[PDB]
Design a protein around this ligand. Sequence first.
Ligand code: GDP
Length: 295
Amino acid sequence: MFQQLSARLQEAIGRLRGRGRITEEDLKATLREIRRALMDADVNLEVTRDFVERVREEALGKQVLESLTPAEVILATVYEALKEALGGEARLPVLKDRNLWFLVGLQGSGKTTTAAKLALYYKGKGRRPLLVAADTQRPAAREQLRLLGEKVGVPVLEVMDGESPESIRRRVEEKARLEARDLILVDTAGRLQIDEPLMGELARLKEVLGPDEVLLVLDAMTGQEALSVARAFDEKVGVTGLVLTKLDGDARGGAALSARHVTGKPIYFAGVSEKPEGLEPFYPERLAGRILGMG
Ligand SMILES: Nc1nc2c(ncn2[C@@H]2O[C@H](COP(=O)(O)OP(=O)(O)O)[C@@H](O)[C@H]2O)c(=O)[nH]1
């Protein structure tokens, strides 16, 4: 992901390198090339404009028009902007004594496999996870998580068809008690498109279970519709953090890049492969460095 954008940003910066001091017109041309490139990666006009303005301001503050190496000033400011556009420092959910997190999103987003990968990740960090297959309408969706839980060595409770949220609560509580589970990961129903009633039932499930986190899983190979999925889930259910899956895929990446800005929710993890350990904590500073060719 981001290959084309990466190449283009590195080219724009490299074009300045070794040619000494630049003029204001030269700087304008470079900022244009950056803003346009972002565009061509399908970043929305606002994220592009704001990003380039940030860079212009910070570069001018660093006396880019006095520098004999403006390329390095532009590199540093694009890096620092790009790192904060993605979240700044790395964040992860606050682990307290007994946690309950929803995973929400579309079918095909990576949501169900992410639930199992999270369980594995946190089991390795000493937590005691429980997976909950919460689709009350589609047994096949629950069976998928059951198998994945088996794969990662984490117990799975399956809800029953049509089970009330109160009953789900009661059964999850019981199992968590008996098995000393301290991280409960609820894989909620996924559909290929936003399903309004589901969204109603999901909001209700949230009222009854009271999750500490609601993690929206988005496929980073998709476009701006990912952020309108994000708005729909956030308005109606209320979301606390993002997981971006399939960062290993080929795609423009503009919607993924902006997700942190459009949604105002931290990216906690990113999926980087189809393997059980393809999941890892998201580090803005690391993705920014990659995109700019710094390893
Ligand atoms: N390469 C790669 N594939 C992924 C990743 N996350 C999910 N997948 C694949 O995405 C597809 C859909 O995932 P699944 O968990 O079934 O999605 P769900 O329908 O939202 O629950 C499956 O083929 C997964 O193996 C990822 O981070 N990298």
